[PDB]
Amino acid sequence: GVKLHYE
Amino acid sequence: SMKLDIKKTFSNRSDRVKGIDFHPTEPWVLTTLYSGRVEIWNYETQVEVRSIQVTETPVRAGKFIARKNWIIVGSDDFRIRVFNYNTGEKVVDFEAHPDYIRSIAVHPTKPYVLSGSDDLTVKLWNWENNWALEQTFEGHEHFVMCVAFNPKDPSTFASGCLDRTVKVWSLGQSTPNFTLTTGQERGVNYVDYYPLPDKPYMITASDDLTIKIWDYQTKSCVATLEGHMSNVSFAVFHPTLPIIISGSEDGTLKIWNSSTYKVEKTLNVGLERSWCIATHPTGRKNYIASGFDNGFTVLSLG
């Protein structure tokens, strides 16, 4: 799934 | 107005630095990297003290526990690990949350560690009780991005969350003493306490480009600091100088006057996006350090 604040 | 005499003490390039911390008595800085590596640098001699490939995943959180000669680190593989920095020994290694660890805070006197996670919780660990999970704090509704003890009353702590709130909690109690509805509509990435006894202040930073100052007794917003041009990764009060230091995905550090709340200096250190901050805990040389996409820098102020 999409992970916010991935960076 | 302010006289700032900013000197670069040491900078080195590395993979993206997500966590950073100063040792209180040795001239060392810890960096934790997106590559899964952690580094301890002596910033006076400019020599690496120790480094460890901890994991293959990002290590977003790292702190010294100087009274135990340890570093503690948390990573996207869900695990807390502790290493003795004199020997390299791995003291403990356990799954702390079922999701990313964003932030670790260490109690100033008791053997307590807090971890904040994408699992929506903060957890309290006691290293003098076999690293027991002593408490889980539930109530946030999105990723917990930052945890910090109140240095003047570390029976309480604050969590900052992408649910747009800060919650302040008491150890041993299951609901927040209060929740600050920050009005930072893209979430809270960072929360910090003003460290001196004269002001009961906290500070929050957001993807909405703002920094806000809060009085934790009145629960009111004292000031909003605008000027960053992309997500604000952190904002802290300096322990000895009357300034706030913030950093952003705009590539800058900003130093703001802590009485007028106006910007005093913008620094582009040339390492692309800024992610993390540390202030030397005794105010030695007024040192600060920040971690970026392309490395870290240690600066002496005034």
Numbering used by the authors:
A (entry chain C): 301 to 307
B (entry chain A): 0 to 301
Quote the original article.
Hence, this loss of critical proteins has the potential to compromise ER proteostasis and generate cellular stress. Overall, the coatomer functions to retrieve the escaped “client” proteins, such as type I membrane proteins, from cis-Golgi back to ER by retrograde trafficking. In particular, the S protein – a type I membrane protein – is delivered to the ERGIC from both the ER (by anterograde trafficking) and the Golgi (by retrograde trafficking)3,10–12. Here we utilize recombinant SARS-CoV-2 S proteins and tail peptides, including constructs with enhanced mimicry of the coatomer binding motif (clientized S protein), to elucidate the atomic structure of the S-coatomer interface.
To determine an atomic-level understanding of S-coatomer interactions, we attempted co-crystallization of αWD40 with either wild-type (1267Gly-Val-Lys-Leu-His-Tyr-Thr1273) or clientized (1267Gly-Val-Lys-Leu-His-Tyr-Glu1273) S tail heptapeptides. The S tail extended motif makes contact with the binding site residues in one of the two β‘WD40 domains whereas the upstream tail residues interact with the other β‘WD40 domain, but at the face distal from the binding site. The major difference is that whereas only the main chain carboxylate of wild-type Thr1273 interacts with basic Lys17 on the β‘WD40 surface, both the side chain and main chain carboxylate groups of the clientized Glu1273 residue form extensive interactions with a β’WD40 basic cluster of Arg15, Lys17, and Arg272. Overall, the two heptapeptides occupy the canonical WD40 binding site, which provides electrostatic complementarity to the dibasic motif residues, Lys1269 and His1271. B Glu1273 in clientized S forms complementary electrostatic interactions with the β‘WD40 basic cluster.
